[PDB]
Structure formats: structure tokens, C-alpha cells
């Protein structure tokens, strides 16, 4: 992930940035103590 | 006797030319450098790893 | 880049120019930055004080012997810079 700590108020939405080397993004975000899995299908980059 | 040998070879600064900046075209696992140099200029490349 | 002038048969230690005050270089940083005369552009008639950055007369300026002007260069390290001074002698 790009960032380390996030300001959290209540029942809201936040965004994070990340970098990966796999076409699949099946990983675990530990938002503020507990874990939560995330699934994706990433594309190859345009820039060589 | 001994005499001094004058004109000691001392450190100093002195300008060198800066060549024309290459044009880098990007292809897959590689780059093509387009190079312009009126005088012979040194290009040195190395890989950032074990070999 | 600097342009200075002197009169004819001046004396040793007489003021010629202030390199640091004219170039904007900080005077108290001259020792740490290494303000020094370039070994090429040296003259047997003008020398500069290292601490004050002031160029003065070292030897009495003979108008007939030196001729038509005089040139000197200074160099400084961290950052690396070079400067040139050209001095006219009157008749």
C-alpha cells in the first residue's frame, strides 16, 4: 500500500493506493486492526 | 645541493562539454538511445543486478 | 566576468577589487568552500586575500613591462564554480 495510517471518523468511505506484480490481486487489507480480503483482476501496464 | 622543481601539478576545476541529451524510445524489455555527438563521446551501460 | 581597473605604478597592498562583494558570494563561507586563485590564470602583479575575498596589488605595476590587460581566475568547491576577472592598467 502507498499509505500507512488513515483518519477514520464513522461509517464512511476511504481510498488507498497500492502496487503489485501479479495479474491477480487477492490480498488482505488490515483496516485498523482486523483483516479483510480483496479480489481483483489487474491488467498489464501500457508503459514498457 | 638541491633545487626546487617549479610548477607543481596542483588540483583545480575545469569545464567539460555536456553532450546532447539522448532520445529514448521504449520497446518491451529494452530502450533505443538516439545519440548525436559531433565529437566522440563515451556511452557506458550496465545492468542493475547480479551480472 | 569582473572588470576592474588600476592606476599606473600603484603600491603593494593597495585596493583593486572586492571579488566576494561583487559576485554575491558569502564572505564567511570562503574558507569552507575553498576560495582560491586558479593555478592557470595567475599574475605576478596582483594577489587576493583568501579570508576577505579582496584582490590587491602584489608587485608594483609596470605599464611598459606588461605590454593589453591582466586576467585572473578563482575557483570554489562544494559547489564547484569558476570566475574570471579582467583588470585594466592606465597609462
Swiss-Prot record, chain C:
Coiled-coil segments on the chain, per record: none
Location relative to the cell: Cell membrane
Tissue distribution: Moderately expressed in all regions of the brain examined, as well as in testis and ovary, and low expression in all other tissues tested.
Source species, domain of life: Eukaryota
Domain Cadherin: 1-91
Task performed by this protein: Potential calcium-dependent cell-adhesion protein. (Microbial infection) Acts as a receptor for Western equine encephalitis virus.
Protein name according to UniProt: Protocadherin-10
The gene coding this protein: PCDH10
Amino acid at each position: 500500500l502507498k499509505e500507512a495510517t488513515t483518519h477514520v471518523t464513522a461509517t464512511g468511505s476511504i481510498t488507498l493506493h497500492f502496487s503489485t506484480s501479479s495479474p491477480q490481486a487477492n490480498f488482505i487489507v488490515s483496516l485498523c486492526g482486523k483483516k479483510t480480503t480483496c479480489n481483483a483482476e489487474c491488467k498489464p501496464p501500457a508503459d514498457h | 645541493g638541491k633545487l626546487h622543481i617549479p610548477f607543481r601539478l596542483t588540483p583545480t576545476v575545469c569545464p567539460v562539454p555536456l553532450a546532447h541529451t539522448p532520445t529514448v524510445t521504449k520497446w518491451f524489455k529494452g530502450i533505443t538511445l538516439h545519440l548525436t555527438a559531433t565529437r566522440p563521446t563515451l556511452l557506458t551501460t550496465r545492468k542493475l543486478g547480479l551480472r | 566576468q569582473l572588470h576592474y581597473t588600476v592606476q599606473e605604478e600603484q603600491e603593494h597592498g593597495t585596493f583593486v577589487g572586492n571579488i566576494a562583494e561583487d559576485l554575491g558570494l558569502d564572505i564567511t563561507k570562503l574558507s569552507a568552500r575553498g576560495f582560491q586563485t586558479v593555478p592557470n590564470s595567475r599574475t605576478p602583479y596582483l594577489d587576493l586575500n583568501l579570508e576577505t575575498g579582496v584582490l590587491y596589488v602584489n608587485e608594483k605595476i609596470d605599464r611598459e613591462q606588461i605590454c593589453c590587460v591582466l586576467h585572473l581566475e578563482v575557483f570554489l568547491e562544494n559547489p564547484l564554480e569558476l570566475f574570471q576577472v579582467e583588470i585594466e592598467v592606465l597609462d
